[PDB]
């Protein structure tokens, strides 16, 4: 029934999972989220996550879309990404061309702090750290971005809009109740159609709060409260991928 996830309810429901932000950064966010939302002409802007660096100066990353339309069977959102070392001032994350988008997936290890860092890869190729961060955010968003099913609907002119009459998802424990963001409302694609053991759901029947954690990307959490229909998600931790999933499970 909600139209945009709160930044306070997300931090409250995901505090236990370690998805927390500093109090000073929380106040700075509360002040400087609308400023960037108006400076960029975006109708929706929410905090996407927080990535750890070799310094204490983690990257806070917020995403925001202005239009969201159906295109070749994919719900394409025209997202813009912004980063900030502190909660006050935001900078932009320019998209990455395919050559460097493939030369950035081979660079591993947790990032440094200064976004003006050049990695050198193999003749030597110089790649900016902001490109690597953009690649990691794109990979996590492709693999993970999760919303409850039927929470979006298709109107005339083929635009995906929130379902104002969404009554909630029965059986919140089941993974079938949740879907990726880029799945069309008509298609019956959910997280069940992913790999069998890559999503863990723990549901408290009493308080009516379900919690979905990504095991392929260990730092992605998504909560869904059903008594009042409120769902949110956050990624906290480094952006690296968990390759050896078969051994761990």
């Amino acid at each position: 029934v909600q139209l945009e996830p709160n930044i306070t309810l997300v931090l409250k429901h995901l505090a236990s999972c370690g998805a927390v932000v500093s109090a000073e950064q929380q106040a700075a966010l509360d002040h400087s989220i609308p400023i960037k939302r108006i400076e960029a002409g975006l109708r929706s802007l929410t905090l996407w996550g927080r990535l750890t660096t070799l310094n204490g100066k983690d990257y806070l990353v917020a995403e925001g879309y202005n239009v969201a339309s159906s295109k070749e069977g994919a719900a394409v959102y025209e997202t813009k990404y912004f980063y900030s070392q502190d909660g006050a001032r935001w900078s932009d994350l320019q998209p990455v061309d395919s050559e460097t988008a493939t030369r950035c997936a081979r660079i591993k290890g947790m990032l440094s702090g200064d976004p003006a860092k050049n990695y050198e890869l193999e003749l030597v190729f110089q790649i900016p750290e902001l490109a690597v961060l953009r690649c990691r955010v794109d990979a996590i968003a492709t693999a993970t971005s999760v919303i409850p099913t039927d929470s979006t609907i298709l109107n005339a002119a083929s635009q995906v809009v929130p379902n104002r009459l969404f009554a909630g998802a029965a059986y919140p424990e089941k993974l079938e109740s949740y879907q990726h963001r880029f799945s069309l409302p008509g298609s019956g694609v959910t997280l069940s159609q992913d790999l069998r053991g890559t999503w863990a759901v723990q549901y408290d029947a009493f308080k009516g709060v379900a919690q979905v954690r990504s095991l392929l990307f260990p730092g992605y959490f998504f909560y869904y409260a059903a008594n009042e229909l409120t769902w949110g998600s956050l990624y906290v931790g480094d952006g690296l991928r968990n390759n050896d999933l078969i051994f761990m499970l």
Partner: protein, 52 residues
């Protein structure tokens, strides 16, 4: 079908559009207390302005 079929002759408006956005002086002032304000540079000489 009617929604898809309606004619819509989008023509060049004589005026450039103006933004309807609330004033942001108070919130900007509130933000200005977070972090350290870096010393501005003097355009004439790249050395920074005198400070206290």
């Amino acid at each position: 079908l009617v929604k898809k079929s309606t004619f819509d002759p989008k023509e060049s408006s004589p005026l450039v559009p103006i933004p309807v956005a609330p004033d942001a002086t108070q919130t900007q002032a509130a933000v200005s207390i977070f972090g350290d304000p870096e010393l501005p540079i003097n355009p004439a000489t790249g050395e920074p302005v005198p400070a206290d």
